[PDB]
Design a protein around this ligand. Sequence first.
Ligand SMILES: O=c1[nH]c(=O)c2nn[nH]c2[nH]1
Ligand SMILES: O=c1[nH]c(=O)c2nn[nH]c2[nH]1
Ligand SMILES: O=c1[nH]c(=O)c2nn[nH]c2[nH]1
Ligand SMILES: O=c1[nH]c(=O)c2nn[nH]c2[nH]1
Ligand code: NA
Ligand code: NA
Ligand code: NA
Ligand code: NA
Lengths: 295, 295, 295, 295
Amino acid sequence: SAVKAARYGKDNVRVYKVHKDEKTGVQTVYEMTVCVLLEGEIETSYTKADNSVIVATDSIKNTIYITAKQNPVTPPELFGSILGTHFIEKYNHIHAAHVNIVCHRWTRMDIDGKPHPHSFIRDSEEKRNVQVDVVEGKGIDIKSSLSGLTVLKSTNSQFWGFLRDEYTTLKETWDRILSTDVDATWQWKNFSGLQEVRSHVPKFDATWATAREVTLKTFAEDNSASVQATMYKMAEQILARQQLIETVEYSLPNKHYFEIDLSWHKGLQNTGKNAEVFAPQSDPNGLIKCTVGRS
Amino acid sequence: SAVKAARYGKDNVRVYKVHKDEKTGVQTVYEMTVCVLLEGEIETSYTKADNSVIVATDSIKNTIYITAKQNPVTPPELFGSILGTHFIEKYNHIHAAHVNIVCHRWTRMDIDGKPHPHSFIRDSEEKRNVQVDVVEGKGIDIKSSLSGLTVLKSTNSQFWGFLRDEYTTLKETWDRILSTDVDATWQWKNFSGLQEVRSHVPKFDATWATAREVTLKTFAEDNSASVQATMYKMAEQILARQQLIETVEYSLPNKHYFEIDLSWHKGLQNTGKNAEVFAPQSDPNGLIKCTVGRS
Amino acid sequence: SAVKAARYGKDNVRVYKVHKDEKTGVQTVYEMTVCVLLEGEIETSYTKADNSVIVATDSIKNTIYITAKQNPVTPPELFGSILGTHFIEKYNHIHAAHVNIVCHRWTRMDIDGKPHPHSFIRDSEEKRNVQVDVVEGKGIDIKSSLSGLTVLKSTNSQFWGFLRDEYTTLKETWDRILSTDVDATWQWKNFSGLQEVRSHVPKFDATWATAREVTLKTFAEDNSASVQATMYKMAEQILARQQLIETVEYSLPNKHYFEIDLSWHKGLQNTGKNAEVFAPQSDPNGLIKCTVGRS
Amino acid sequence: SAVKAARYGKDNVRVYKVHKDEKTGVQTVYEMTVCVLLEGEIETSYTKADNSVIVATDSIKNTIYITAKQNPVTPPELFGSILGTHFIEKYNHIHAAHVNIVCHRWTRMDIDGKPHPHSFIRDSEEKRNVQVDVVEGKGIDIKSSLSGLTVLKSTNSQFWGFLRDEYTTLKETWDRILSTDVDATWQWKNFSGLQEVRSHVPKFDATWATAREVTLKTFAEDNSASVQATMYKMAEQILARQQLIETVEYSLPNKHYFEIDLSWHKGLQNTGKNAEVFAPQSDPNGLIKCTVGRS
Ligand SMILES: O=c1[nH]c(=O)c2nn[nH]c2[nH]1
Ligand SMILES: O=c1[nH]c(=O)c2nn[nH]c2[nH]1
Ligand SMILES: O=c1[nH]c(=O)c2nn[nH]c2[nH]1
Ligand SMILES: O=c1[nH]c(=O)c2nn[nH]c2[nH]1
Ligand code: NA
Ligand code: NA
Ligand code: NA
Ligand code: NA
């Protein structure tokens, strides 16, 4: 036998950073969970008990904190690029660094109608993420995403005209609830290195904002023919509004809300146009995916 | 042996309800998770296999949906009171109904600066809850709460002057991070029945709003001497602003953020006034509780 | 306003301890999660920013580790008693210590038919717990429990003869699946102090073993008339087999498995005596409780 | 823009099946969570609101239950192959079916030293899984795995000789705790279709058993130089004992247990050879991966 693939590092590194404005007194906080996995000429640590090739995962942890101290942690695309570049430049035998960052929300509080200088609220478990792959000789590959964006619309969702055969019991509908947890990823053009990533820094926050806005507006406004049709409209718009993105991926659960027939009880009408009370279904769920690129 | 206590019913009943405005077209959604447990002359179901005294938990589930169809589900204090009253009035041998409701957030979306008539976002896993205990001959006892309100302030928290002995290693501080998940409960004066609960209906949403506002403003603005001192200020204000509340309870974790000494690496200064990067601690956590009443 | 109740301390303290046998080489591991909350003359920490009365939660954490180093951590009833007694004896103004311990499973591995001296497996997330309340002048109150014991029987469960009215749709059955997560608590006679707790130490492991054995055998062998009837049989047996227990409490979810009618598809028969494939329901669930004492 | 990739179906389908032995009365239960995602000529459902190409996810759910009724659900490799083959054979425009199965443990109870005919216990949240990819023209690709196997050894783990530089603070050790959650995958040789999968059916349970046994014995017995070195030994053995496997993948967290220096308290010695009480760390964790193939 032989090693065909190997990567290792530190997962679940929680990181907080505060920025304190000298002039205004305004403080801004950032909180992340970071994973860094390394590849390189490390197979002998597996096959020969050769630990000399291992940058200790504990050291990778130290390096995450040191890099956060000495560099911006925002946008996460930049921080991940800096972090990944460090490992492949510092260690001759390390040839790839894979950096995953989950950003947690700390939204500035409004108190009596005014923004507070140092108090924050976790307004939802929605995350902003990056996957940054820094590979020697292949530049920097960045996937940006938002996830855990949970939404519901109470009407203007339809699903009819699907295939019907002997396995089919689902009734066609022209008015249903649609609810999902949005997981949306945009994949950037390859960057040649840190200089090029830095040259595009404003685009990262801007494109995240675009992706989120397009998602919410399209969800709210599309009289949806299916999850498939709606998610495609989101993707196509995002591609049209940032040329440095090559693809957009959506993964959407269809979190079903079932009508409840109550007519067995005193002829109570609670279906169709009379449907008011529904049973949210924890499982199973439709799962719909696509990757959209340029034609 | 003998039955000393018994209660039973249905837990984790997910409920959605939509209200559709005939005139404006605006839709409003409500989503809850409901538990109803009953007490009464039911001990023989345990001791003698006498199922004749059991209102099936499946029937309790049906009743939750039927009651939601025929009554307002908002405020949850009212819905719980109606639900609990139903069981003790309908069944001669049922003498108490214990109703727990967890309300999930579905906040109306703003699209292009305008509120959308039928699209919603889960803006955080913060919950609004009630515990409604309807007991024959003892009226209706309601505990209202908010929970999972997660907040952080980056300065203006202190902790010094605590007891120091041979078990103590904690250094005094005049500037630390304070973060918590707020669990706050206000206990209403006993209500004599549904008429009295209904007579106070506007107060339930209003007092929830007060509790939340006081929590956020006090957290943000108090130069905190301790979690103990700050949570007491919250409680005292809430009691002063709603006379129909008898007690306020807080349960607050102190979700620690530790400084990281990096001076071992190139003399990097990251402690005290130089502290920028911190290690959020998943565990353990301080846990601070109090119940505040009127003097 | 005034403080009506207050308690505070450290939650979620993870603790591991290893015992190494000098003579045999056999090692034994223990892992727990500990919470200690204190009460006493501490109200001024809430009302007057008086931290002088606060034994820091950080110090409580230190004390948990120190006590584990200097004392047995098994049985958890003993460790909790020692821990709680420490706080009320050490601190004049602390009058109660509330100690919760969750014990995690590390079962010795069998390798090639022989027990291994230092390798362990988490064989299930079933927990063994204690709640130990040490109150000055009121001795030591111990509640022992097992929880997260998940079981299923595929037949020999019935449920018929329950109340039927206009809210009822549940069909009577003489053969159903029964599955639950067992939460069972036995409450000990009050102990006067550490000497009396220590005098009964062998009974704690023995009674836990009895409770578990009775639970499993009764579940497996009872042709169950209801969850109510079966859980009562468990309790009554436990009380009969340990006289130092005053009450037994069970809390049992009925984790429903629904038949699936497939007759719409090629007349497939999958109900009643033909039922083979079922839909496990995540929610809702029946929830059945009782506390059984001596007659 | 254009669809570059698309797949959709039903996730989180919970399935129970009971087998009842006519002659012995012995019952055997199986419980799974199933996901089926389909690919094919379905892009117009995304681009043109063409639902005619969609086999409804609800219908996929029905099909899972019907297939479980009419076929063995064990071994999961077989069930997944049957399920996947159904979709690509039944639907001309569906060209791939991706089937994920998570198998849940229901281990037969032993009561009074004898196996019980119809009562079961969830002995751990360890799972047995398969990923079965059935692609028209490319046969059946099966990945089998075990996951959530949580283990700990209290000694005979070492980690020294790793790279040391200005980012390193980790001390070398010749005696530490090692704990992990095992995720192990074995990838089968491509199968040409159902006939070939069926021809190897006994090998699936046998190879799962081998993988588990090798994992546990190697973990217990290897005086470990690193997670890397130990996991490689596991893989190499598995490959040597089943020739129809092409690769073995391990993903192992290093779930750290930290020594606690208590010497600040009365000179208490709890480090090095005196280490008894440890602090289990929830995060961060080392994460070590490799894929091993034949040389
Ligand atoms: O939007 C939907 N897409 C689907 O593929 C589907 N299948 N059942 N319901 C559905 N809804
Ligand atoms: O606010 C605090 N209260 C406490 O009781 C405590 N103990 N350690 N740190 C603390 N902070
Ligand atoms: O055992 C049961 N007890 C109950 O109270 C009940 N209600 N529905 N099904 C039930 N099963
Ligand atoms: O087994 C280990 N492998 C590693 O790569 C490592 N890094 N820190 N500790 C470690 N232990
Ligand atoms: Na390199
Ligand atoms: Na009554
Ligand atoms: Na005392
Ligand atoms: Na096909």
